[PDB]
Design a protein around this ligand. Structure first.
Ligand SMILES: CC(=O)N[C@@H]1[C@@H](O)[C@@H](O)[C@@H](CO)O[C@@H]1O
Ligand SMILES: [Ca+2]
Ligand SMILES: [Ca+2]
Length: 395
């Protein structure tokens, strides 16, 4: 499942991770939208090449071969690459990666400019788009701008990570209008309000139907379901949860019926890093003897966030502290639910309190749907935060 990237229709490019690449849909996608590698006539660049990392390697269809410049950016020199197409070609996107060898990410175009020419020769280039990407240097990114005709496309490494501009691949794509519609599903990057054109179930369901023959329809489903969850959301109704020591976690048969499978955990994270090697993944390793401990400390609240693969209805969260001393036992807890896979869509489900104790405690509340859960350490014994296990039980 992709998530909407936000609309782009200024002259600042939208740059996002090209997650499409990992999918079984890629080939069908490329068939329809990619500019064939066979339409790329030639490539040159102004900085030469390092060793055998020749410029042809930037457009050979292999993410495991790269060009690297022979001359790094400096205060006086900016690396650029010029691609010539067989014929004038309409393009709205570049998909780009830096080198992916042992120095992966080195030379990533952290800032770039894109220029068009309709000629084969001459310096008549006009600025099409400028952009940046600050998230990572290791990513395959989609750079999306206004659809433009190119005989030659010039790509300038305005800032290259560690100056030594590199490219595993430059790939080119034609406009995908339905994809852009999907990119405009939400009003902003928080993805917690559906855009006006989809802002009813009637409109959203019609849109889903409209996407059904699209090559990456299956990847759109997650975002569509997120929108639907927002459209159908009810007012938050937090209660006080009842907290008590429990031992039913020992009961395998019970767990089979009532405990959410650990395999349903897509991801875990927290806001406070961790102390020593008491990392977060051991709050969910199914071992009461291993525990997470925060790197930060209350004042600030510690919070843990668990993402699920499948939405699940829970009525209980079971937790315990580090068993040695009980340091960082959540004495007071806020439980937040989101019904979306991403976005700023959490609502408060329940508040609860219990004295620190050995063993496991359930926090029981009203049955609630969770696609993701936030566990907030309101008050914690000794202003630390610790989890030996975090478990989720159904009504
Ligand atoms: C493997 C590795 O890091 N190779 C790089 C090489 O590609 C080039 O950037 C060079 C510049 O002095 O620095 C390193 O040797
Ligand atoms: Ca390559
Ligand atoms: Ca554990």
């Amino acid at each position: 499942g992709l998530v909407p990237r936000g609309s782009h229709m200024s002259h600042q490019a939208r740059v996002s991770k090209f997650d499409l690449y990992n999918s079984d849909k890629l080939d069908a996608y490329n068939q329809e939208f990619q500019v064939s590698r066979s339409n790329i006539k030639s490539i040159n660049n102004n900085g030469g090449k390092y060793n055998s990392s020749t410029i042809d390697k930037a457009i050979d269809g292999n993410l495991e071969t790269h060009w690297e410049t022979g001359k790094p950016n400096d205060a006086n020199f900016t690396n650029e690459v010029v691609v010539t197409f067989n014929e004038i070609t309409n393009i709205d996107r570049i998909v780009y990666s830096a080198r992916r060898d042992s120095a992966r990410g080195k030379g990533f175009a952290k800032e770039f400019e894109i220029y068009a020419s309709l000629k084969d020769e001459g310096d008549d280039f006009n600025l099409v788009s400028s952009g940046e990407y600050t998230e990572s240097t290791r990513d395959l990114v989609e750079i999306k701008f206004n659809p433009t005709d190119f005989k030659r496309l010039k790509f300038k490494f305005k800032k290259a990570d560690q100056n030594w501009a590199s490219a595993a691949e430059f790939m080119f794509y034609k406009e995908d209008k339905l994809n852009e519609k999907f990119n405009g599903l939400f009003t902003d990057s928080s993805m917690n309000k559906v855009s006006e054109e989809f802002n009813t179930l009637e409109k959203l369901n019609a849109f889903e139907n409209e996407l059904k023959d699209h090559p990456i329809y299956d990847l759109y489903k997650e975002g569509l379901n997120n929108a639907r969850a927002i459209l159908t959301e009810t007012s938050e109704n937090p209660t006080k949860a009842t907290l008590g020591q429990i031992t039913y976690n020992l009961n395998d048969d019970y767990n089979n019926q009532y405990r959410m499978p650990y395999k349903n955990i897509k991801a875990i994270k927290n806001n406070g890093r961790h102390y020593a090697a008491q990392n977060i993944e051991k709050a969910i390793d199914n071992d009461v003897n291993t525990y997470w401990e925060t790197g930060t400390l209350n004042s600030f609240n510690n919070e843990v966030e668990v993402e699920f693969n499948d939405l699940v209805t829970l009525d209980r969260i079971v937790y315990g502290s580090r068993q040695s001393d009980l340091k960082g036992f959540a004495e007071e807890v806020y439980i937040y639910a989101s019904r979306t896979s991403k976005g700023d869509t959490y609502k408060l489900v329940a508040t609860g309190a219990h004295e620190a104790t050995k063993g496991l405690v359930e926090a029981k509340f009203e049955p609630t749907e969770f696609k993701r859960v936030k566990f907030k350490f309101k008050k914690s014994k000794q202003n630390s935060a610790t989890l030996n296990e975090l478990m989720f039980y159904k009504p």
